[model samples]
Target: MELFQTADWKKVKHVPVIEVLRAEGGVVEVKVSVGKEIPHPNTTEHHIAWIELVFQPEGSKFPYVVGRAEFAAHGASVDGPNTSGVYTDPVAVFAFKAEKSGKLTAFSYCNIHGLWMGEATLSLE
Candidate 1:
């Protein structure tokens, strides 16, 4: 659909699941994950490639790149696909100082499903 596909994060696997937790001193804990509701294939042929998170402060003209996480392991190695014992699940968690009211957006890339995005509000009220 269109350039990229988007669906409800609660019902899809590709859509990024965004969560926020407020802490003391205005620090905000964030967790961005994929396959939370529907488990996507973790095999070498089909898996999440990477994820990127951005923060757009209120009244800001553009968004800032909070970070980019690249998944390296997909149970693939010299032996063959799915031969490895370890796999990198499509999930990441981090925290930042919530300085201003803003919005948080997450982007996820699937090797076969393309790109999927989801957004959440960043409130300090």
Candidate 2:
């Protein structure tokens, strides 16, 4: 079975958008967000739970877990789902140190849509 699924974030709201904010001075900054262009459902029944990021250094055997972000709240409360008027967006801003180039991959999980992924290649000079 496929561990995850991939698609254009522009077309699908569940897909993560992996963008390299900065990639210099040995530190790489990335922002992994879902529903950038078109927002996703932020309801209790259906929403993005968390986002995971990893970096596979060039010629490396395994990739390193750069970082992870979890969105615990989805407007859930005694009043009922989405009635709290408070919701957490599925977005993660993380940075890692990498001397060489590598592959930057991100994963996002939806409460009802399963898992989605986004990938980008980093090339260093």
TM-score of each: 0.86, 0.86
Please tell me which predicted candidate would have the highest lDDT against the true structure.
Answer: 2
Clashing pairs in 2: none
lDDT (10s digit) by residue, model 2, range 83-117: 88888989889977788898988998988788888
Candidate 2 — which residues are off by over 4 angstroms? 1-11
In candidate 1, how many Å is residue 32 off? 0.3
Cα lDDT computed for each candidate against the true fold: 0.85, 0.86
Candidate 2, residue 59: CA error in Å?
A: 2.3
**Model 2 lowest lDDT segment of ten:** 5-14
Clashing pairs in 1: none
Report model 2's TM-score to 2 decimal places: 0.86
